[PDB]
Amino acid sequence: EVDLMVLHIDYALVNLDFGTAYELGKQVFEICQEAGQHMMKALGDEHWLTFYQMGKFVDPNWVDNEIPTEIIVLQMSILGRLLEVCPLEEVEIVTSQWSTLELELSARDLVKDKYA
Amino acid sequence: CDFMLDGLAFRDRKTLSYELGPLFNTEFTKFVKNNASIILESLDSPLKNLVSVINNKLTRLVAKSEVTNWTHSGKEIQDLLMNKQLYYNLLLDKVLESHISEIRSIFEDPKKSWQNLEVVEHIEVTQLPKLFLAISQNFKSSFADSHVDEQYFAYKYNLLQTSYMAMCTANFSHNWCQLYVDMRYLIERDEKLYRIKELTRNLLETKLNMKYRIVCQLIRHQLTEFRENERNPSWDATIEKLLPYILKEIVRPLQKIRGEEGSRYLLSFLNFLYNDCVTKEILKWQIISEVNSENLGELVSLLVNNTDIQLLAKEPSYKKMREKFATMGKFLPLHLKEIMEMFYNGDFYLFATDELIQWIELLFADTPLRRNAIDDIYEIRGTALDD
Numbered sequence: 001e002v003d004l005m006v007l008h009i010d011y012a013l014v015n016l017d018f019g020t021a022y023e024l025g026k027q028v029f030e031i032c033q034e035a036g037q038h039m040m041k042a043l044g045d046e047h048w049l050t051f052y053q054m055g056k057f058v059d060p061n062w063v064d065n066e067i068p069t070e071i072i073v074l075q076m077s078i079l080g081r082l083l084e085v086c087p088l089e090e091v092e093i094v095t096s097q098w099s100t101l102e103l104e105l106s107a108r109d110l111v112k113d114k115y116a
Numbered sequence: 117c118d119f120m121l122d123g124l125a126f127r128d129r130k131t132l133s134y135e136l137g138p139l140f141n142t143e144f145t146k147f148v149k150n151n152a153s154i155i156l157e158s159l160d161s162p163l164k165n166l167v168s169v170i171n172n173k174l175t176r177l178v179a180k181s182e183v184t185n186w187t188h189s190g191k192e193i194q195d196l197l198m199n200k201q202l203y204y205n206l207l208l209d210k211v212l213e214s215h216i217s218e219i220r221s222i223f224e225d226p227k228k229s230w231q232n233l234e235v236v237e238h239i240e241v242t243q244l245p246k247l248f249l250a251i252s253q254n255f256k257s258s259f260a261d262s263h264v265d266e267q268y269f270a271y272k273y274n275l276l277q278t279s280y281m282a283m284c285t286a287n288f289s290h291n292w293c294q295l296y297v298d299m300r301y302l303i304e305r306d307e308k309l310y311r312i313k314e315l316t317r318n319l320l321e322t323k324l325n326m327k328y329r330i331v332c333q334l335i336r337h338q339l340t341e342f343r344e345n346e347r348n349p350s351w352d353a354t355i356e357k358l359l360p361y362i363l364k365e366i367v368r369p370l371q372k373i374r375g376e377e378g379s380r381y382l383l384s385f386l387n388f389l390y391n392d393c394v395t396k397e398i399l400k401w402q403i404i405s406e407v408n409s410e411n412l413g414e415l416v417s418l419l420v421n422n423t424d425i426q427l428l429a430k431e432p433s434y435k436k437m438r439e440k441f442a443t444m445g446k447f448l449p450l451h452l453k454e455i456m457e458m459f460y461n462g463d464f465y466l467f468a469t470d471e472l473i474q475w476i477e478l479l480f481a482d483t484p485l486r487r488n489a490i491d492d493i494y495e496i497r498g499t500a501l502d503d
Contacts, residue, residue, distance in 0.1 A: 037224070073326075080286030083279060084223060088213045095279045106318050110325045111332050111392075 002028050002039075006047045013054050016061075021054060022074060029081060040085045048086040055079045056097055067101075068115040069108060076101050117173045121180065133181035140174065141188045148193060152206050159200060168197055204264045211258040212272055215251050219280055222247050223287055233294065239374055241298045245305065248280060252306070274311035281315050293369035296320050300377065324381060327366055328388055334358055335393045342411055343401070349411040351418075359422045362389070371427055382428055389423070390441045398444075399471065404478050409449040416445025440466035444475075452480050456489050459496075469497040 005024050012021045032039040055078045058067065067075075079098045086094065108115070120129050133140075148155065148167065155163050171193035178188050199206070222230065222244070230247065233240040255276065259269055281299065288295035299316040303309055338353050370382045398404075398412060420442040428434035443463050447455050455476060458464075464472050473490050480486045 077286070077289070080282050083282050084220065084286055088216055091212075091216050091279050092275060095275055095282065098282050099278055102315070102318060105322060110329050113329065116329075 002031060002043055003046075006043075006050055009054060010050055013057055016057075016059060018054075018057060018059070018071065018074075022078070025054075025078065044085045044087055048082070048090060051078075051082050051086065052090065052094060055082060055094065063115055066115050067104070069105070069110070069113055070116065072101055072105050076105065117170060117177060120177055121173060126180075129177070130181045130183065133177055133183050134185055137174075137178065137181070137183060137186040137188065141186060144170070144174070145192065148196060152196065153210075156196070156200060156203060156206070164197055167193065171197075202264075204262045205268060208259070208262055208264045208268070208272065211255060211262075212276065215255055215276060216279060218251055218254075219248070219276075219283060223283055236301065239297045239301055240294065241301045242294070244284060245298055245302045248302065249305065251276075251280075277309060277311035278315060281312060281319075285319060292319070292323055293372055297373055297375075300373075300375070320381070324366075324385065327361070328385075331358060331362065331366075331389065332393050332397075335397060338415075339397055339401075342408060346405060346407045346411075349415070351415070354415060354418070355422075359419075362423060367423075367425060371425075379428060379431070382425060383431060383433060386423070386425070386428070386434065386437060390437045394419070395441065395444070399474060399478075401478055404448070406449070409479060413445045413448040416441060416448065420445060436466055443467075447475070448479070452476065452485055452489050456492065459493060464493075469493065 005028050009021045009024050009028075012018075012024075028043070032043055055075050057075070058065075059071075062068065076098065079094050079101070083091065083094055083098070120132065124132065155161075155167060158164065171190040174188050175190040178186075230243040233242050235241075252273075255273065284295050284299075285292065296316055296319070299312055303313050303316070307313075334353055334357065338350075338358075341350055341353075366385055367382070370378050370385060372378070373381065394416065404412065420438055424438070425434065443466070447458070450458075459472070467475070472493055476486060476489060476493075480489075
């Protein structure tokens with residue numbers, strides 16, 4: 001079921017449905033969190049690449065090709081939760097991406113947000 | 117691979133490569149990686165010779181098989197085989213893996229005994245600072261007899277710091293200020309955590325700027341309501357949304373910070389709230405009607421009356437800003453004569469001369485009484501600067 005749902009998340013990224021994608025992500029995360037540790041490890045070793053791909057999603061249609069601060073914090077939380085159970089050999093890149101967001105996060109005008 | 121090359125037919129080899137060369141690539145790669153220690157243990161070894169053979173042979177397999185669905189440049193194997201000059205970066209990376217797995221398991225505790233927060237001088241701080249300190253101990257200890265360059269250790273150490281803080285923030289989605297105070301305690305325990313300090317200041321600025329966005333958007337929406345509607349100002353956004361959000365998401369957490377940083381961010385927050393959210397925003401108005409002036413007066417009144425922070429009552433800036441704001445909410449619905457005579461009393465000592473003139477112009481229309489008032493205030497502030 002998680003497999004079908006992550007497939008759906010994948011093809012929705014193919015469809016750019018970051019909303020529904022993140023919703024199913026909420027869904028599957030909470031599903032596994034009350035499923036168990038084995039499930040954490042399994043989903044991790046099976047689809048951390050998926051989660052990474054989609055935590056590094058960029059919409060070409062974004063205003064000025066700039067990521068919305070809402071989407072910024074969204075992907076930020078995404079990477080934060082991922083980092084907890086993703087395989088070790090990847091901790092760097094995601095973290096970089098994390099900082100990649102964070103620095104960008106620390107580089108916008110928040111009161112008058114062009115991307116809100 | 118021998119049976120691939122010299123044992124299969126062209127189409128056989130081709131099919132079988134097409135099918136498993138991806139798996140071949142990934143599995144042989146990950147094996148070499150996991151076994152990097154024993155293979156790069158020696159400079160020249162039948163193991164390294166054989167593995168270079170296998171790499172060349174797999175490359176020749178990609179070639180002879182002429183496969184595209186999977187490719188194997190072998191360049192990675194060539195490089196790792198040539199990765200003889202580090203011999204410690206691999207070990208340091210294994211140490212990194214151990215430490216990150218350690219910190220992960222640290223968060224994987226089902227009993228959540230690490231979440232048990234202990235009051236240390238008075239800040240409640242979880243047990244995670246101690247475990248992170250210990251992991252830093254273990255890592256600096258691992259670097260002791262490692263010949264790793266001191267330029268890769270700093271990057272990997274800041275990477276640990278960043279990853280760890282991201283882990284915690286993910287585990288501190290709602291008690292983020294507790295995380296902030298725990299890491300402030302860590303900084304007080306170890307000032308060499310500059311990545312930690314910059315990141316925690318950045319995420320604190322992030323959260324405050326986020327609620328600042330929320331409150332300025334909600335304030336601009338309330339001012340939009342005020343400019344659009346004059347009968348029902350709809351204090352709902354203020355009374356049950358803005359004031360409680362401020363108290364229990366800003367005031368109470370910033371007090372929980374409980375330090376010069378807590379008080380300073382409270383003080384900056386009420387700068388942004390009194391001045392930036394309201395004073396600057398109200399000053400941006402074009403005209404204020406009598407009913408709109410009464411509504412702003414009431415808003416300002418129940419703000420100063422609803423945002424008093426007795427913790428900062430001793431702060432001269434707090435008192436000055438709150439008195440300026442309360443006297444704003446006072447003089448908003450008053451008449452020009454009252455304004456002039458309470459200015460003669462000196463109550464506008466917190467208001468700028470130009471700000472006061474703009475206030476009178478936005479409140480009171482084009483009248484010679486307003487011109488007298490403005491010239492009186494101007495020249496009073498002019499003789500007040502020659503002494």
